[PDB]
Design a protein around this ligand. Structure first.
Ligand SMILES: Cc1ccc2oc(C#Cc3ccc(C(=O)O)cc3)c(CC(=O)O)c2c1
Ligand SMILES: Cc1ccc2oc(C#Cc3ccc(C(=O)O)cc3)c(CC(=O)O)c2c1
Lengths: 139, 139
């Protein structure tokens, strides 16, 4: 459970946002890429796996199953690719910040920041960022 | 101490690697950018700050003091920029992996992965990755 992530794509202003969700915490990492490709996905996974425990990645379609680069990233980093499994919450915050940022990728990272640091209902308990640290700190 | 980072640049194959070190853990985040610019630095800081507690960033020269974008990122994210303060360890591991990766940026992230996951002397105690989680988990 500390190593379980969901991976999805979302789209805004004709760009692609790669989104990884730490399922138990709701903690997010996101990346704006020029184009959906195996290589970009592989790179994102390798960066995420260098930063957090990533044991298993769930995706909801076949696209990641067709990349030899994703396959090599999986084997390099020890990530199990499993089939079968926030995007709209993220687009809401991106909409709140879009006009403080010249570039979409800036607004996406401002949205990721707010998502990971905020408390639920704006008061009490832990943010997603505190929750992932607390889940991992308990080995 | 949980929020204290050092920020530096390093260079390989004519590219620029942005390196942030969590001073108490030795945990690293790194990014290959096309060009040293204020904007790229600001973006890197905002991404790091969305992911970890970043309270204070130490740098060892004036370059980050001259960017209005870095200034705006600092104020947006609540990061204190302080003057006054791993690169060679990272270039060693990059040298070990360079030939498993077509792109330098891939080799840099493979190096970051090994740096953050390895134990000191290859046995016992915590990796940098476990150390940063343990330091933050103790609020
Ligand atoms: C308040 C704040 C905080 C962080 C920020 O990061 C950026 C940026 C950037 C960037 C642009 C282009 C490339 C590229 O060429 O790929 C890379 C990075 C800004 C500028 C903006 O967006 O308002 C910014 C502002
Ligand atoms: C085993 C393994 C693990 C992860 C990996 O990521 C990549 C990649 C990539 C990339 C290239 C170009 C852009 C760009 O156009 O900016 C962005 C990302 C690879 C391919 C390589 O480098 O060997 C790779 C392999």
């Amino acid at each position: 459970s500390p190593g379980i992530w969901q991976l999805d794509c979302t789209h805004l202003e004709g760009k692609v946002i790669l989104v990884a969700v730490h399922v138990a915490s709701g903690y997010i990492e996101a990346e704006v890429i020029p184009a959906e490709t195996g290589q970009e996905t592989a790179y994102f996974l390798l960066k995420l796996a260098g930063r957090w425990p990533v044991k298993t990645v769930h995706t909801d379609n076949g696209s990641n199953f067709t990349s030899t680069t994703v396959k090599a990233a999986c084997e390099w980093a020890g990530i199990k690719q499993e089939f079968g499994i926030s995007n709209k919450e993220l687009k809401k915050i991106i909409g709140q910040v879009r006009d403080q940022a010249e570039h979409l990728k800036t607004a996406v990272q401002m949205a990721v920041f707010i998502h990971n640091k905020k408390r639920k209902g704006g008061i009490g308990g832990y943010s997603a960022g505190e929750r992932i640290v607390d889940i991992i700190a308990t080995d």
